[PDB]
From a paper:
SV40 T-ag is a 708–amino acid protein containing at least three independent functional domains: an N-terminal J domain (amino acids 1–130), a central origin binding domain (obd) (amino acids 131–260), and a C-terminal helicase domain (amino acids 266–625). In the case of SV40, a single virally encoded initiator, large T-antigen (T-ag), can bind the SV40 origin, assemble as a set of two hexameric rings, and cause local distortions (ie, melting) of the DNA. The T-ag obd recognizes the GAGGC-containing duplex DNA at the origin and also binds double-stranded DNA (dsDNA) and ssDNA in a non–sequence-specific manner. In this paper we describe two crystal structures of the SV40 large T-ag obd: one in complex with duplex DNA and one as a dimer in the absence of DNA.
Author numbering:
A (entry chain B): 130 to 260
B (entry chain A): 129 to 260
The structure:
Amino acid sequence: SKVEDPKDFPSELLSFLSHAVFSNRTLACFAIYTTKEKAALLYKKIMEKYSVTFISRHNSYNHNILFFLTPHRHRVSAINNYAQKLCTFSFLICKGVNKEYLMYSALTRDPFSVIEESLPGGLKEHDFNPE
Amino acid sequence: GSKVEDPKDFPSELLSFLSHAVFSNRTLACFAIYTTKEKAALLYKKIMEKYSVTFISRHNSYNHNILFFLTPHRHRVSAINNYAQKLCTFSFLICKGVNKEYLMYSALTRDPFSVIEESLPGGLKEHDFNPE
C-alpha cells in the first residue's frame, strides 16, 4: 500500500491544486483522486450530498479523478471526512482546487479524459468568468 | 429514513433457504448478501478476494442486488457480516448464512431474480452440490 497507492494527484495537476489540506480557508472547488470503482460510486454520493453545482469523473490512467464545485463553501477536511468514510478501503486523495478552470480543462485532455459529467458539454473558460 | 426505505430482510421468496441466527457460533461455507446494486458491485470483487471464494454470483432482485458465495473453509456468519458492514458504510446490507445452498442459488437464477455475473461460467447445477 505504501508500495501501491498514489501519494498524491498526478504531477501534471499539482500546480492547480491547493496543498494545505488542513486549512480553514473554505473553498467551493474540490478534487478527489481514487480507484475507478470508488469514483463511480462517489460521483453520485458527492452529487447528492453536496448538491454540487457541477461534478465530473475522469480517467487518470489506472484510476479516476472526480472534479466538482459546490453551491457553497466548505473546508477540505470536511469533504475529506465524508469521502474517506463512504468506502473504507483503497486509496483516496481529496484536495482543494485553486485553479478551477485550469484544473477542469486538463482533465478534459490527454492523458486525462472525461468519463461523465452532470452537465452535458460540461464547462468552458467563460463559465468561470463573471456571470 | 432507513426504517421506511430499507429492506428489513431478504425477499420472502427466499427466507426459508436461510439461517436466521445471525449471532450463531455455528460456522458455515455458504453465505448471501442483500444490499444496493452499487454496494453489491464493489462487494462482488472485494468478497471474492477477501474470502478466496470457491464461487460467487451476483443477482438482480427487483431494484437491488443479491450476492451468493461459497468459501473454502467455514466462517461464523457474524464474521462475514462485519467485513461487509465496514467496507462501504452507507446503505442497507443484510448478510445471512445459507442453509439450502442449491435451492438458494437456483432460485436466484429464476425470476424475480437473474444472474448479473458469476465467477464460474456458466454457473452451477444440481450435480455440483452433490457428493463429488
